[PDB]
Structure 1
Amino acid sequence: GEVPIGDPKELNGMEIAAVYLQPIEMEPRGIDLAASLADIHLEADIHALKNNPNGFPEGFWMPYLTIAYELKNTDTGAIKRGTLMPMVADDGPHYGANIAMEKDKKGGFGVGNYELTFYISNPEKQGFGRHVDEETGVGKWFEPFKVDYKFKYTGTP
């Protein structure tokens, strides 16, 4: 089961929530950190709100986002950064990454209080287009932004 990370945020036509679960195994291999090296799988759950201004139907997954994360243990001061990758699981597409916590050879990423930040850029950064004609067009994309969560990490689930 998935453990909630903080409270979700609504902005820029999107619901942006974070969860973690046990490490997963991803194909293609050699991209996501291997499950045996990780303690959690971190997911960003990002879906269109009602009346999304960029034309995405309510509830649709928001694709082609560029997303980085920053995870800070506020007890130890340890900070790490990485990027979340687009992928699909049994419960649909998301952006995810296996992450070493206890297993991080640097130390300091064990059980404790955390701050998580997502840094998110719009689909155009990856060449995704938008109609702009009168008949079928949609509005401009958001500028890059961050969202912050606070959570307690209680150990590899």
Structure 2
Amino acid sequence: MLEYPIGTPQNLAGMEIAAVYLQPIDMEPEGHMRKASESDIHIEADIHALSNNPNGYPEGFWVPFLFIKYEITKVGGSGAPITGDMMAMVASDGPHYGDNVKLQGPGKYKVKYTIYPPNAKENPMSPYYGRHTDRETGVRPWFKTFSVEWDFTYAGI
């Protein structure tokens, strides 16, 4: 699949956190994404386990049941961020966290993701995902909510 990377990936808590963007998409169920015709991009968080991930994920596996909030700010604009929540979904290249976003024209932007673990109060998927805690098959506790930032230049795609 064809995508545009936003900066360089960041490694935190045995996970690789990468930011990418593409053209606005169409998704099932309908009515969750902002219509493709009213958006500029599909913003995406690519989260995969690294070697020796402490939550039992083999290397390169998708990290599931996370909750991602984003804030996008145009450099030299109003000063008010474009905010939203991502949603977990699958595309031709595999599962990810994404959202159709309307930007504020060509320019430099700051992108911030707030990544919530599966047990966070803010994560709506918390009652649906568990973690083994016994000695023989258990894993380490979940990481705590954290934020990651990148810069990028948007020209129009």
- Secondary structure at the counterpart of residue 119 of structure 2: helix
State the partner residue of 2:123.
none
- Distance in 1 (CA, whole Å) between partners of 2:62 and 2:76 is 34
Q: Which letter does structure 2 place at the counterpart of 1:93?
A: P
CA distance in 2, matches of 1:132, 1:18: 31
> Following superposition, which runs of at least 4 residues in structure 1 exceed 4 angstroms of deviation?
none
What whole-Å deviation, never above 9, does each CA across 1:1-48 have from its counterpart, x for those lacking one? 311111110001110001111111011000011111111001100000
Match of 1:31 in 2: 32
Aligned partner of 2:97 in structure 1 is: 95
Which segment drifts farther, 125-134 or 81-90? 125-134
CA RMSD in angstroms comes to 0.9
Q: CA deviation at 1:78?
A: 3.9
- Normalization by structure 1: what TM-score? 0.92
Could you list the per-position Cα deviations for residues 39-93 of structure 1 after superposition, in whole angstroms to 9, with x for gaps in the alignment?
1001100000111000011111011001100000012134111001000000000
Q: Name the residue aligned to 2:114.
A: 119
The one-letter amino acid paired with 1:87 is: M
Q: Deviations over 1:108-131 (max 9, x none)?
A: x11111110000110123132111
Q: TM-score, normalization: structure 2?
A: 0.92
1:150 CA drift (Å): 0.8
What is the SS of the residue equivalent to 1:124?
Answer: coil
What CA distance in whole angstroms lies between the structure 1 residues aligned with 2:81 and 2:12? 26
**SS at 2:37's partner residue?**
helix
Q: Counterparts of 1:25 and 1:75 in 2: how far apart (Å)?
A: 31
For 2:59 and 2:74, locate their aligned partners in 1 and report how far apart those are by CA, in whole Å: 34
- In structure 2, C-alpha distance between the alignment counterparts of 1:89 and 1:99, rounded to whole Å: 17
**Alignment gaps of 5+ in structure 1:** 102-108
| Corresponding residue for residue 132 of structure 2 | 131
